[PDB]
Amino acid sequence: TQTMKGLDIQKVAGTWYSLAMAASDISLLDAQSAPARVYVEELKPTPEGDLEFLLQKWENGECAQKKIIAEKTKIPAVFKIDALNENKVLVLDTDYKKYLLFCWENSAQSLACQCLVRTPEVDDEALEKFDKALKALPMHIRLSFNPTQLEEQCHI
Amino acid sequence: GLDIQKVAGTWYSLAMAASDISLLDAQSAPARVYVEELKPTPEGDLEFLLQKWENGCAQKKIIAEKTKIPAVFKIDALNENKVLVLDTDYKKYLLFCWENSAPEQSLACQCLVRTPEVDDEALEKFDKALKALPMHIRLSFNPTQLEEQCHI
Ligand SMILES: CNCCCN1c2ccccc2CCc2ccccc21
Ligand SMILES: CNCCCN1c2ccccc2CCc2ccccc21
Ligand SMILES: CNCCCN1c2ccccc2CCc2ccccc21
Ligand SMILES: CNCCCN1c2ccccc2CCc2ccccc21
Ligand SMILES: [Cl-]
């Protein structure tokens, strides 16, 4: 999986909306509570060059929040979220101002990718770049959300 | 022009898409139905033999009655539910949609193939047909899922 060259995380800070999602396996995304059914609400880079994700997910009939710190690695658009180097964040592309494409990757191979946007509207260009970036990847499910869902907790 | 005799026989649901996530987001979801067989009738109707996952595979026959429009079939007498055949080469793939027009229109489309194998060309024709439709969920099956009927 190829990641962005020359990513500056200082330019990704702020609130985001998970516009579309895709995964290598149906059961990662299909259920409301599926393991990869996670909604990115905010990105916060640290001075150290780590990337904090503020996430929402449906559990046990309620929307829950979690902060995940993705730690910098030797590769500038690749972050680790465990000590065992099993789970990674891969940033594929961003124009900073409108959209950001990234994947969760687990190499115990599971892949769940998202198209994030800065404003809670459909961006056809962002969706097109998302689809193009996914062309090389073995995705078996894709989901996209309407503007109304983008503004509700857990995209209800 | 669609020839319903040539669409007869065994099929496999390779991929599915729908206008609404909740139509396809569980084995239990209303549009999560797998096509096993198409049978044309002498009267020019099209029988869909389906399987649906229920409490861990149940079989269902639905008759799609011919209309005055070719490749458009009605499932009920209230003209609420329709089958639209989008495209087929008879021997490899068939694309179709369930449609319902009862406050928002529902659409659920499939790519059927003649053998339980991934067909990248058929999946590409399906992807092209869906570009003009407002689909919010899409999923495709691997050869294991193709052979295991309703089980994925
Ligand atoms: C079956 N439990 C799934 C894990 C829950 N999860 C949450 C919880 C709330 C919001 C986001 C997430 C995503 C990932 C994560 C990370 C760390 C602990 C729990 C969770
Ligand atoms: C497989 N690890 C936990 C499952 C959910 N998860 C995914 C999903 C697909 C690919 C990788 C990962 C890595 C960790 C992670 C982090 C936050 C949400 C979901 C997930
Ligand atoms: C492996 N590439 C799949 C080809 C297109 N495909 C996509 C595309 C992007 C994300 C997910 C999927 C899942 C399967 C699917 C189902 C129906 C049409 C296209 C696709
Ligand atoms: C009784 N089932 C009604 C809904 C499921 N359904 C759908 C789904 C989406 C769009 C149209 C339809 C038409 C009816 C029908 C026929 C066969 C399988 C599913 C469905
Ligand atoms: Cl989608």
Curated annotation (Swiss-Prot), chain A:
SUPFAM superfamilies: Lipocalins (SSF50814)
CDD domains: lipocalin_beta-LG-like
Distribution of this protein across tissues and organs: Synthesized in mammary gland and secreted in milk.
Entry's localization field: Secreted
GO molecular function, one term: long-chain fatty acid binding
Disulfide bonds: 63-154, 103-113, 103-115
Function according to Swiss-Prot or TrEMBL: Primary component of whey, it binds retinol and is probably involved in the transport of that molecule.
Family: Belongs to the calycin superfamily. Lipocalin family.
Protein name: Beta-lactoglobulin
Organism: Bos taurus (Bovine)
